[PDB]
Design a protein around this ligand. Structure first.
Ligand SMILES: *[C@@H]1O[C@H](CO)[C@@H](O)[C@H](O)[C@H]1NC(C)=O
Ligand SMILES: [Mg+2]
Ligand SMILES: [Mg+2]
Lengths: 13, 188, 178, 200, 244
């Protein structure tokens, strides 16, 4: 199995 | 170097209780070691921890796809990643190398009787000292758990002793890597 | 009861970025940004699990962008340097002519920038030296391990020299045979 | 890595439903995309599926996701002509790049009302050596086959809706400059309805 | 709120540098380029975010590049055009930096790469007026448009009635046919039908036009042959309503 990255989001704005 | 530094450090946490029965996920963001905004599974939405993270909590909460990815990380990310490593992580067991030794002098003088317990995993250990088969409840100067950082631990439980010839001191280490309590001896 | 942490960071103007996985205080892996690849802490991990480095690289890109948004938002407020607490210790109890490992433990510091030098008889040592990446603490400060495999002799003097912007002068932590 | 779609092409009668499948990797799944791509237009997204066992619905289009076995089903309930498109399937892992399947080209065979199969002769006006023959107003069973003569050109059937006399009609075109050529023989290599109207 | 691309189609000669233009959606953070060689699957070329390439094809740095001129545009440059590079080039964009959202595709650019620009020919366009038998038998009238002898393929046929473009009553071949299937350099033919009521065709105040947008030679391309330069152009044919 694979380790999954919690994908990051760009901040406001 | 003298120029000013600016640090953004995200931390995505997965806290496990009863193996995988109750999992809590935290998406935390730190600007210059100060937490600005967070998402806590148990809350269900992004909350500003500080005034700097207020526009981020408003924005990230207004984005249905961001929310539903956070809201589902507990199974998609946490429970999934827990299961990926379980074999070599949750079920890793490395046996400790127990070795008793004095700090050197003559009997009838006081001395510290060391009990070096090295290279074990996990850090769950209970070390116990014995004088002629009777548990010494006090006079122990522990070093506590030392994380070696190579998925290995080490602890040193020194005994405050006034040794007399004929006395046999025994170090008893209980740990998950062993079915039977490990024992090392030192006679005065 | 366990805890897995995806611990990232990006630091300016150094333009340094990090990404790693921590299981109960220990590194599962980190991503080499120069070589764009996964570096497993213990070789065996690589044989049972996999990871796509792009996930880290995409997150670091966002982290780089967010840092710049954040620093403008904070009227350009810099970080307050917290000096480290250096500790020299060995892997096992020392015995002469039996090989051992020296562990230099840098702890409770921020920003995550340090110059660590091993010294044998006041001279720098590059042979066999290994290091960990900046490991996370629950207080949001850092940890870092520096390793030195050595042969125990009564004529050797080992020193771990640590340089940090929170330190007034380089801290030297000494080790010697009893 | 690799995504596969089955069948490459499909025919469905207007009113009838069809379904098709997409086979994607069973490890390192982040998402599955379904796009509709009409010949004229650009690929337009239908669904982005992230949670295993979830089912998405966009009017008559429906999709299911099985992460563990690496497959997805797309369902079109009661086909309408506007569903004729190439349905594309995409797998997304840790990055943003999409890995695509070869697609499923869906052709919604229309429901032709009041057929009147006929072969007509159109006039040249006036700058061409070509005389054209139009095979028009036949049902969807009729199939247009290629010419057996290298100097006669035959196009495949095509449906038009008038929205003035609001009905749908099929038709094909045959042409040649040849002194020989006539509409009475233009479509001789095709399976033509017995009652096809040839005027004189 | 769509992704834009220019030009619709482009004809080029082998070994040349081609610059494909795109206008990603205004607020979008990720840009992409994908390409589809006829018969083959849609292939990822390059990903781009925060003025830096994210992901790229094995083929990408050797054969291509990406420039972000202003904060409105994004471009793909093919360094040295190969015959294998004849494909449909799509530009895409995503809103979020997280990548869990949909990709919006532009209309695409069809690039045709030619070994030699000698065999390029524009189309000949003719309109054929409705059959009198048909009007008498159905009270419907269909005009046919033939576009012949063009090279290469991908041409845009349209009908115009009294100046306005029409989509109702129209049907055009989804693919052209080869004029000489035994040849690799075979010129193409294409047809379209326009069906109107007999009452409409019978009004002589009614104007009907059929035009074909052809894409060929640029004004900078070398042309030594005697026939007119087969430049990108609109060839048209028309007919007027007949009372008969
Ligand atoms: C490391 O050394 C270089 C050169 O002496 C210096 O510029 C930099 O500030 C040092 N880093 C720290 C953390 O002291
Ligand atoms: Mg986020
Ligand atoms: Mg799972």
């Amino acid at each position: 199995r694979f380790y999954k990255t919690l994908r990051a989001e760009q901040a406001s704005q | 170097d003298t120029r000013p530094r600016f640090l953004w450090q995200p931390k995505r946490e997965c806290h496990f209780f009863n193996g995988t029965e109750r999992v809590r996920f935290l998406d935390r963001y730190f600007y210059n070691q100060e937490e600005s905004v967070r998402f806590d599974s148990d809350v269900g939405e992004f909350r500003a921890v500080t005034e700097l993270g207020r526009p981020d909590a408003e924005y990230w909460n207004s984005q249905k796809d961001i929310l539903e990815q956070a809201r589902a990380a507990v199974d998609t990310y946490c429970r999934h990643n827990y299961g990926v490593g379980e074999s070599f992580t949750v079920q890793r067991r490395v046996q400790p190398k127990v070795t008793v030794y004095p700090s050197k002098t003559q009997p009838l003088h006081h001395n510290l009787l060391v009990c070096s317990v090295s290279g074990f995993y996990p850090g769950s250990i209970e070390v116990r000292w014995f004088l002629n088969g009777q548990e010494e409840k006090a006079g122990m100067v522990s070093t506590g758990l030392i994380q070696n950082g190579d998925w290995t631990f080490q602890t040193l439980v020194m005994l405050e002793t006034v040794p007399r010839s004929g006395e046999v001191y025994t170090c008893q280490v209980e740990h998950p890597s062993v079915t039977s309590p490990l024992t090392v001896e030192w006679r005065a | 009861e366990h805890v897995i942490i995806q611990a990232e960071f990006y630091l300016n103007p150094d333009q340094s970025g990090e990404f790693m996985f921590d299981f109960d205080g220990d590194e599962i892996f980190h991503v080499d940004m120069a070589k764009k690849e996964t570096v497993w802490r213990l070789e065996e991990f690589g044989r049972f699990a996999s990871f796509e480095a792009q996930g880290a690289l995409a997150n670091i890109a966002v982290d780089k962008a967010n840092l710049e948004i954040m620093t403008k938002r904070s009227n350009y407020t810099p970080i307050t340097n917290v000096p480290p607490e250096v500790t020299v210790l060995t892997n096992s109890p020392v015995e002469l002519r039996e090989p051992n490992v020296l562990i230099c433990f840098i702890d409770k510091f921020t920003p995550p920038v340090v110059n660590v030098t091993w010294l044998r008889n006041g001279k720098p040592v590059t042979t066999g030296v290994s290091e960990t990446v900046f490991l996370p603490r629950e207080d949001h400060l850092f940890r870092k391990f520096h390793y030195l495999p050595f042969l125990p002799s009564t004529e050797d003097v080992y020193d771990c020299r640590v340089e940090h912007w929170g330190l007034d002068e380089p801290l030297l932590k000494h080790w010697e045979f009893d | 890595l690799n995504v596969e779609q089955s069948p490459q092409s499909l025919h469905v009668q207007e009113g009838d439903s069809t379904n098709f499948t997409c086979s994607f990797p069973s490890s390192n799944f982040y998402a599955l995309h379904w796009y509709r791509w009409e010949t004229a237009k650009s690929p337009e997204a239908l669904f982005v599926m992230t949670l295993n066992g979830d089912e998405k619905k966009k009017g008559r289009i429906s999709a299911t996701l099985n992460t563990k076995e690496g497959y997805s089903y797309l369902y079109i309930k009661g086909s309408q002509p506007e569903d004729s498109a190439t349905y594309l399937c995409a797998f997304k892992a840790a990055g943003n790049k999409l890995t695509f399947g070869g697609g499923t080209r869906v052709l919604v065979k229309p429901n032709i009302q009041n057929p009147d199969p006929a072969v007509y002769q159109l006039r040249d006006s006036k700058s061409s050596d070509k005389s054209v023959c139009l095979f028009t107003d036949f049902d969807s069973q009729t199939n247009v086959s290629q010419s057996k003569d290298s100097d006669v050109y035959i196009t495949d059937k095509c449906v038009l809706d008038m929205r003035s006399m609001d009905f749908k009609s099929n038709s094909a075109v045959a042409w040649s400059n040849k002194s020989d050529f006539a509409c009475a023989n233009a479509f001789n290599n095709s399976i033509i309805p017995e009652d096809t109207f040839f005027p004189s | 709120p769509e992704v834009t691309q220019t030009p619709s189609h482009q004809v080029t000669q082998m070994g040349q540098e081609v610059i494909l233009r795109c206008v990603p959606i205004s607020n979008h953070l990720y840009f992409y380029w994908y390409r589809q060689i006829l018969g083959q699957k849609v292939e990822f070329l390059v990903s781009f975010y925060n003025n830096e390439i994210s992901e790229k094809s094995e083929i990408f740095d050797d054969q291509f590049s990406v420039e972000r001129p202003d904060g409105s545009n994004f471009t793909l440059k093919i360094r040295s055009t190969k015959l294998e590079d004849s494909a449909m080039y799509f530009c895409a964009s995503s809103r979020l930096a997280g990548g869990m959202d949909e990709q919006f595709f532009g209309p695409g650019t069809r690039l045709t790469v030619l070994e030699d620009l000698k065999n390029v020919f524009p189309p000949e366009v003719a309109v054929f007026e409705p059959s009198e038998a048909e009007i008498s038998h159905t009270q419907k009238a269909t005009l046919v448009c033939l576009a012949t002898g063009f090279y290469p393929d991908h041409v845009e046929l349209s009908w115009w009635v009294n100046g306005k473009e029409v989509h109702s009553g129209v049907c055009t071949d989804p693919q052209p046919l080869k004029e000489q299937p035994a040849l690799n350099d075979s010129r193409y033919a294409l047809s379209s039908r326009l069906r109107v009521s007999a009452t409409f065709w019978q009004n002589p105040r009614n104007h009907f036009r059929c035009q074909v947008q052809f894409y060929g030679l640029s004004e900078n391309d070398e042309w030594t042959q005697d026939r007119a330069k087969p430049v990108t152009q609109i060839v048209s044919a028309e007919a007027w309503g007949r009372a008969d």
